[PDB]
Amino acid sequence: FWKKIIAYQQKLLNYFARNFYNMRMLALFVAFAINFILLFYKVSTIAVHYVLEESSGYMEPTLRILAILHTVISFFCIIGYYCLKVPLVIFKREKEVARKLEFDGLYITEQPSEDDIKGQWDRLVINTQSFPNNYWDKFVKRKVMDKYGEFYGRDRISELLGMDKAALDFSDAREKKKPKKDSSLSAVLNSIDVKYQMWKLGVVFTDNSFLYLAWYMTMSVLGHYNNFFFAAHLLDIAMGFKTLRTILSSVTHNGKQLVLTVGLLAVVVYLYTVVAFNFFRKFYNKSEDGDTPDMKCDDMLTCYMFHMYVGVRAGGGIGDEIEDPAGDEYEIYRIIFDITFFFFVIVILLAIIQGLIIDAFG
Amino acid sequence: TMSVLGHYNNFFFAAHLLDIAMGFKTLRTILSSVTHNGKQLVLTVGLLAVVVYLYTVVAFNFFRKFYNKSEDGDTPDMKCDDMLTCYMFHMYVGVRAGGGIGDEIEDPAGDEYEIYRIIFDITFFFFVIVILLAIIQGLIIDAFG
Amino acid sequence: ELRDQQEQVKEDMETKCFICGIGNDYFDTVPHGFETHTLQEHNLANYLFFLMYLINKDETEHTGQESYVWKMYQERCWEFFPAGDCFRKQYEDQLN
Amino acid sequence: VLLTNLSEHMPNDTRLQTFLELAESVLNYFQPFLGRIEIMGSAKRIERVYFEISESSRTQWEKPQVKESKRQFIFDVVNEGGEKEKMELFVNFCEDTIFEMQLAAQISESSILTVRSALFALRYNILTLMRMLSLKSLKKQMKKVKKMTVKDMVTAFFSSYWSIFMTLLHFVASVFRGFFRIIC
Amino acid sequence: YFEISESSRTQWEKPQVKESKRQFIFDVVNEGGEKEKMELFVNFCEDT
Numbered sequence: 082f083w084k085k086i087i088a089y090q091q092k093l094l095n096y097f098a099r100n101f102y103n104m105r106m107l108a109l110f111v112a113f114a115i116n117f118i119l120l121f122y123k124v125s126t127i128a129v130h131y132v133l134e135e136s137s138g139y140m141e142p143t144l145r146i147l148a149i150l151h152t153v154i155s156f157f158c159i160i161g162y163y164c165l166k167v168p169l170v171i172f173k174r175e176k177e178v179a180r181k182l183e184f185d186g187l188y189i190t191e192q193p194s195e196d197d198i199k200g201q202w203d204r205l206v207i208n209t210q211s212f213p214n215n216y217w218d219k220f221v222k223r224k225v226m227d228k229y230g231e232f233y234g235r236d237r238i239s240e241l242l243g244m245d246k247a248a249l250d251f252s253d254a255r256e257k258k259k260p261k262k263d264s265s266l267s268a269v270l271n272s273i274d275v276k277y278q279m280w281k282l283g284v285v286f287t288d289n290s291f292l293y294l295a296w297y298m299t300m301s302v303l304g305h306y307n308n309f310f311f312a313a314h315l316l317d318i319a320m321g322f323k324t325l326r327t328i329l330s331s332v333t334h335n336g337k338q339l340v341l342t343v344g345l346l347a348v349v350v351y352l353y354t355v356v357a358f359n360f361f362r363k364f365y366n367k368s369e370d371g372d373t374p375d376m377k378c379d380d381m382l383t384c385y386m387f388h389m390y391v392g393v394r395a396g397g398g399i400g401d402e403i404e405d406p407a408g409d410e411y412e413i414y415r416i417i418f419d420i421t422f423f424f425f426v427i428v429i430l431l432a433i434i435q436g437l438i439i440d441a442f443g
Numbered sequence: 444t445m446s447v448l449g450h451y452n453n454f455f456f457a458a459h460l461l462d463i464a465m466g467f468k469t470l471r472t473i474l475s476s477v478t479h480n481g482k483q484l485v486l487t488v489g490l491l492a493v494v495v496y497l498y499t500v501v502a503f504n505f506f507r508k509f510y511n512k513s514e515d516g517d518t519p520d521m522k523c524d525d526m527l528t529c530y531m532f533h534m535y536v537g538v539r540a541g542g543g544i545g546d547e548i549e550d551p552a553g554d555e556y557e558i559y560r561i562i563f564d565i566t567f568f569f570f571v572i573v574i575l576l577a578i579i580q581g582l583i584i585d586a587f588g
Numbered sequence: 589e590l591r592d593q594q595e596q597v598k599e600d601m602e603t604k605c606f607i608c609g610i611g612n613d614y615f616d617t618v619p620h621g622f623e624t625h626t627l628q629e630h631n632l633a634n635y636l637f638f639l640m641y642l643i644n645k646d647e648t649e650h651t652g653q654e655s656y657v658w659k660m661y662q663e664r665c666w667e668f669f670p671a672g673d674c675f676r677k678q679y680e681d682q683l684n
Numbered sequence: 685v686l687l688t689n690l691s692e693h694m695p696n697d698t699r700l701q702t703f704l705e706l707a708e709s710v711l712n713y714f715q716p717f718l719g720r721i722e723i724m725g726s727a728k729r730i731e732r733v734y735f736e737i738s739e740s741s742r743t744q745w746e747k748p749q750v751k752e753s754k755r756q757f758i759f760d761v762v763n764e765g766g767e768k769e770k771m772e773l774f775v776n777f778c779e780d781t782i783f784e785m786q787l788a789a790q791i792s793e794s795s796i797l798t799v800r801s802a803l804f805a806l807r808y809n810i811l812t813l814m815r816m817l818s819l820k821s822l823k824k825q826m827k828k829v830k831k832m833t834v835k836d837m838v839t840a841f842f843s844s845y846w847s848i849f850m851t852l853l854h855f856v857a858s859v860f861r862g863f864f865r866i867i868c
Numbered sequence: 869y870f871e872i873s874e875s876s877r878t879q880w881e882k883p884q885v886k887e888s889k890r891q892f893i894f895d896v897v898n899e900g901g902e903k904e905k906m907e908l909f910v911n912f913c914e915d916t
């Protein structure tokens with residue numbers, strides 16, 4: 082009657098954890114199915130309408146069925162890995178903080194703060210009633226007592242770790258055990274440590290994989306609001322496959338260097354914009370009809386926009402797009418301008434960035 | 444079998460020029476370079492397809508009006524009024540293009556979504572043309588080497 | 589090539605000690621061997637501070653080793669620096 | 685210096701080990717001031733040398749300009765260091781750095797907001813989590829676990845984890861809102 | 869010489885432990901310390 086419910090959730094057996102990978106690949110396959118269904122959308126006509134260019138007569142209800150199934154499977158996914166790997170993360174964090182307390186004494190003497198978010202969160206969990214819930218050593222608090230009682234203040238350590246100074250010592254002095262069972266009313270309700278669940282929820286929210294699963298679930302939810310949000314789930318195959326993970330990590334592998342090189346490209350293009358603004362302004366007419374001239378370099382911001390967007394993307398550079406210099410007084414100066422732009426921006430810096438990415442991958 | 448089919452159509456004898464690839468050692472190495480990293484090549488091509496599909500989704504939802512490929516104003520030829528057509532256009536034209544899809548779709552100047560489309564095209568050029576295509580080419584070249 | 593030269597400059601510090609040139613693995617046979625050899629036994633800052641101490645100390649009060657190093661420093665003879673040898677390397681025979 | 689020399693020259697002596705144990709505080713205090721090197725002694729043997737390092741020397745070595753000079757020296761010698769020229773360059777750098785320290789002594793005379801926002805967000809989210817784990821409604825929900833079956837508990841478990849996911853999405857989103865507000 | 873339990877063998881052959889072992893091996897070969905190698909090994913052993 083009340084041997085039930087709890088053991089019974091346990092009859093759920095963490096089956097989500099057991100088939101978490103199977104369930105994840107089911108979600109990936111459902112994402113494939115939904116996004117292949119999306120390929121037959123079309124626009125009909127004010128306000129446009131997205132209607133299915135469909136001929137079999139079956140593709141409309143299966144879209145909603147698959148969206149609901151994907152949302153349910155992703156919710157089961159986030160219940161999984163919380164049944165499965167969250168205890169491992171909690172155990173690792175508890176072990177790390179316990180070793181820091183014992184061998185290093187970080188909170189006894191060092192007191193790390195203001196820089197290590199893990200540090201403050203572990204400080205928050207230090208004084209919990211059940212600190213080593215997943216850690217095997219339930220006596221870390223009393224070991225820290227034995228190590229630092231005479232140095233740092235016996236009572237100060239007692240109130241820092243949140244122990245009762247006499248509970249266990251008189252427990253071992255005299256047996257005096259009173260019966261207690263979890264089947265009693267309100268016992269399970271009050272057997273939950275608010276600060277410990279605080280810390281557990283905080284660290285699992287900090288966890289990267291949990292955040293990725295949360296994003297997956299949130300976009301699976303938003304797919305009902307707009308079916309095109311299910312397209313973001315095709316990126317999951319990049320994490321699923323090893324080589325695609327390497328391709329993704331190649332961008333971040335040299336991120337500082339890539340950002341600095343992009344900044345250098347921006348600076349040199351800005352210099353070229355300055356030169357064109359001061360001298361070669363008349364060459365930047367991008368109008369076919371003579372009545373309405375469309376100058377791209379009458380404004381500094383517009384000139385910088387044009388140089389970036391068109392010259393950097395162009396095969397030969399800005400000179401293949403701006404007016405020819407033949408017959409003008411500044412012919413040689415503009416020829417040098419375009420040749421140097423092509424050599425530095427297109428030939429070198431873009432190749433520098435591409436080589437950075439390729440070499441990171443390699 | 445192709446020597447037999449050459450009598451049915453003489454152009455089937457053109458397939459026999461591929462025999463020199465097996466005859467010569469370096470050409471055999473060139474052919475085997477494709478298969479040397481076949482799994483990785485297939486996965487990278489799949490990643491390229493996925494990212495282009497994401498770009499098609501974005502263009503379909505937001506930048507649809509920019510995909511007119513008609514010179515005459517009477518008959519507009521939209522390449523992104525259909526999801527399949529938009530994916531076809533993005534692959535076939537953008538991936539093959541030197542600068543990407545932005546060198547082929549309409550200019551963004553003066554529009555409300557100017558900066559958004561500029562970011563769209565710049566990111567497309569950086570990821571598809573600059574990185575992923577170079578990733579595939581480097582895979583093949585490094586397999587040969 | 590410039591990038592690889594910088595990487596090799598960074599790596600070569602962990603591979604060998606600057607003063608003696610002995611490979612790091614011999615030190616690492618003892619745990620933290622490199623971290624002790626480079627910081628206490630053969631330390632660039634320690635050698636520079638020794639030179640400054642020799643300059644600041646009066647020549648009359650110089651000990652035997654201090655006078656030896658002073659002579660050879662004035663004569664620009666750098667043989668006092670341990671070339672391919674260390675304390676533990678030299679005393680592997682008797683101490684070890 | 686005497687104790688360190690004796691300890692390093694006769695490691696296998698418990699009698700000296702006792703003296704080192706009783707002098708542990710002296711040696712611990714003197715560690716920043718004791719400088720130890722090895723030289724090629726006149727007796728054709730490698731010999732330890734102990735000397736004094738001044739606090740002013742330590743501070744002026746830790747000063748940034750000396751650090752940059754040291755980085756340039758190290759980079760250059762590893763690139764284009766000579767066979768015998770290595771230690772000649774080292775001693776030239778040592779002299780230059782000694783002068784640099786003298787000049788530096790002459791010249792010299794005499795994020796977290798986001799972390800706290802996340803802290804508060806988690807605090808009130810967990811407050812809500814326990815408050816409906818302990819509400820009178822859940823305290824009365826014990827009649828359904830009488831007419832309990834399996835469907836009631838399936839619904840209850842799904843609702844509980846669904847509310848946990850709601851608290852999670854209130855979090856992170858609140859962190860982003862606060863971060864954007866504080867930065868702009 | 870010691871005893872290895874069948875339950876231990878099965879739970880070692882279980883896939884999640886295998887993935888953890890792969891990650892551990894990849895990480896230690898990349899950024900393994902001089903003395904930190906076996907400390908990381910025993911930390912992984914406790915986690916596993």
Ligand SMILES: Nc1ncnc2c1ncn2[C@@H]1O[C@H](COP(=O)(O)OP(=O)(O)OP(=O)(O)O)[C@@H](O)[C@H]1O
Binds near residue numbers: 604606626
């Ligand atoms: N003689 C030596 N003195 C100091 N470090 C040495 C020596 N030989 C090798 N090393 C190695 O050099 C590294 C120490 O860093 P490095 O020499 O670049 O600068 P540093 O003086 O420690 O200062 P910083 O870290 O501020 O640049 C370690 O890996 C150490 O093992």
Ligand SMILES: O=c1[nH]c(=O)c2nc[nH]c2[nH]1
Binds near residue numbers: 779782
């Ligand atoms: O660099 C140096 N600075 C000095 O002051 C000095 N005196 C002797 N030798 C010296 N070398």
Ligand SMILES: O=c1[nH]c(=O)c2nc[nH]c2[nH]1
Binds near residue numbers: 217913914915
């Ligand atoms: O990882 C561990 N798990 C344990 O249960 C344990 N007990 C002692 N030491 C232990 N280590």
Ligand SMILES: [Ca+2]
Binds near residue numbers: 650
């Ligand atoms: Ca004397």
Ligand SMILES: [Zn+2]
Binds near residue numbers: 607625630
């Ligand atoms: Zn050395």
